Amino acid sequence: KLPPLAPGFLHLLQPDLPIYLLGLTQKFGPIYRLHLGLQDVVVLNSKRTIEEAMVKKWADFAGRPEPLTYKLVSRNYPDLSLGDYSLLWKAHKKLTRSALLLGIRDSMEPVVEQLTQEFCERMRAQPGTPVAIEEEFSLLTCSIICYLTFGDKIKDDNLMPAYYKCIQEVLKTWSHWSIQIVDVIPFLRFFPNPGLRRLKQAIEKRDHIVEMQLRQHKESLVAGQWRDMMDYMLQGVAQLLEGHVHMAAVDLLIGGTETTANTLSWAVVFLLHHPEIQQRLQEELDHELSRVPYKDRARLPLLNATIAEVLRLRPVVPLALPHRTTRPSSISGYDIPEGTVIIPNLQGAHLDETVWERPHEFWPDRFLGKNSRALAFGCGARVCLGEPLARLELFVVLTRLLQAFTLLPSGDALPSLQPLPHCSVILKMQPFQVRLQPRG
Ligand code: HEM
Ligand SMILES: CC(=O)[C@H]1CC[C@H]2[C@@H]3CCC4=CC(=O)CC[C@]4(C)[C@H]3CC[C@]12C
Numbered sequence: 001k002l003p004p005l006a007p008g009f010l011h012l013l014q015p016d017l018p019i020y021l022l023g024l025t026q027k028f029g030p031i032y033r034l035h036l037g038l039q040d041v042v043v044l045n046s047k048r049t050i051e052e053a054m055v056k057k058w059a060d061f062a063g064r065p066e067p068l069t070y071k072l073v074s075r076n077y078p079d080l081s082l083g084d085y086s087l088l089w090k091a092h093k094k095l096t097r098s099a100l101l102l103g104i105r106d107s108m109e110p111v112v113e114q115l116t117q118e119f120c121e122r123m124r125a126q127p128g129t130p131v132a133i134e135e136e137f138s139l140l141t142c143s144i145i146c147y148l149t150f151g152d153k154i155k156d157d158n159l160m161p162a163y164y165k166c167i168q169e170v171l172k173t174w175s176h177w178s179i180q181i182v183d184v185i186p187f188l189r190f191f192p193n194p195g196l197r198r199l200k201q202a203i204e205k206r207d208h209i210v211e212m213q214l215r216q217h218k219e220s221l222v223a224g225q226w227r228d229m230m231d232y233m234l235q236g237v238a239q240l241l242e243g244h245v246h247m248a249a250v251d252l253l254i255g256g257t258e259t260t261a262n263t264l265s266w267a268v269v270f271l272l273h274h275p276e277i278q279q280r281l282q283e284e285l286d287h288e289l290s291r292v293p294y295k296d297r298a299r300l301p302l303l304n305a306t307i308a309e310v311l312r313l314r315p316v317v318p319l320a321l322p323h324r325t326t327r328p329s330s331i332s333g334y335d336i337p338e339g340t341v342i343i344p345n346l347q348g349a350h351l352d353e354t355v356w357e358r359p360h361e362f363w364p365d366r367f368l369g370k371n372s373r374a375l376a377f378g379c380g381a382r383v384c385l386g387e388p389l390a391r392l393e394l395f396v397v398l399t400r401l402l403q404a405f406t407l408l409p410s411g412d413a414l415p416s417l418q419p420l421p422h423c424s425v426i427l428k429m430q431p432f433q434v435r436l437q438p439r440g
Contacts, residue, residue, distance in 0.1 A: 022348035054380030063324035087174025102231030145256035305367035318347035
């Protein structure tokens with residue numbers, strides 16, 4: 001007995017897809033089948049069902065599907081984030097996980113704190129002027145992941161301009177409806193598509209960039225020493241090959257910029273709507289205090305509760321990434337065949353009233369480590385690779401923003417909390433501007 005099948009196609013065209021999927025749980029329960037595109041796919045809409053699949057049945061769902069764009073972005077192969085579950089993939093992830101956790105065990109804090117301070121200095125240029133803060137956070141987060149992957153040469157040969165441009169374009173093209181439409185309806189591959197040709201030209205570099213940096217790290221590399229994440233990964237390689245390192249850097253770079261930047265932007269808009277919270281956060285910092293290190297963190301309980309709420313209420317990767325069943329299994333008492341694609345609806349799951357009371361409301365006080373955790377980063381074998389670095393950025397950036405600045409609306413009106421309807425992969429807010437006034 002398979003999970004119940006909701007009628008229709010293509011439910012993709014629904015305005016707020018994760019919220020549309022949540023609405024279907026009323027009639028069909030937390031777990032059901034439906035036609036996303038032309039394909040039959042099962043969707044999970046509660047923490048209990050997601051954790052049963054990903055945490056309890058670890059290996060059973062761990063896999064990835066392989067539609068055309070997965071192949072197109074890694075022709076030379078082989079990707080981590082889109083790679084299927086295998087023994088070699090596990091070794092792949094283990095290694096890059098070690099580069100983030102041990103390779104930059106030190107550095108990770110100082111590099112983050114140095115670049116956010118440059119960001120704050122850059123914001124002091126023209127106080128009380130309308131700022132495109134989306135683009136500013138994007139430059140900050142991209143800089144951070146670049147410096148940690150590639151090292152000193154980035155602003156030294158002054159490479160952030162070109163690297164930012166490239167990284168932005170790669171994700172911009174891939175996540176567009178053209179390109180993504182070939183994945184859901186395979187036969188449109190033979191159709192003419194401006195988008196695919198734009199994507200191929202955007203893969204050449206990123207590949208030129210990552211390869212140039214790969215070879216530059218290989219010369220000047222000292223065995224036993226590591227200045228960045230690439231130095232680390234190169235020395236754990238040569239069945240894991242340098243091609244694994246290449247794609248691992250790509251996954252770090254693209255996975256690490258727009259995700260943390262949009263989460264930061266979400267926190268901003270939420271803060272703007274709740275001057276009650278911003279003030280309470282300004283009062284908390286001024287009592288600990290000249291930076292408040294990540295080591296402390298617990299000394300600011302409402303800030304961690306606020307961060308957790310933004311992650312809970314606006315998870316930047318709302319439908320995670322698609323999972324593929326590796327062997328015949330079950331979720332919630334229903335038979336789940338091998339090869340079946342699974343969508344963990346993370347945004348919908350966080351909106352469960354049974355787990356979180358008054359669920360559509362922004363309420364940091366709810367987390368004052370108080371009961372029941374969200375999963376903006378997912379869970380199980382496919383957990384976000386960059387979570388530890390992500391949570392550090394959110395702490396350091398917002399902690400250094402709230403002291404030294406007061407967030408004010410750009411216009412006389414408030415910027416909408418409503419995320420734009422046709423989102424692919426990343427949950428983006430409507431383009432807004434902010435006013436930063438010194439002393440907060
Ligand atoms: C707060 C910001 C972030 C959020 C909410 C987030 C969320 C996620 C989610 C939901 C997944 C997929 C989980 C699944 O498939 O079940 C994921 C995967 C991934 N994220 Fe993130 N992420 C963030 C920041 C980052 C950063 C900073 C990096 C790298 C420096 C990164 C790199 C990755 C990679 C490489 C994967 C794929 C891992 C795999 O397939 O096993 N992310 N992220
Ligand atoms: C979680 C997330 O949004 C990130 C993490 C890894 C990222 C992917 C890494 C591999 C990749 C390479 C490309 O050239 C196109 C975009 C993609 C397909 C990336 C899109 C965004 C992803 C899916």
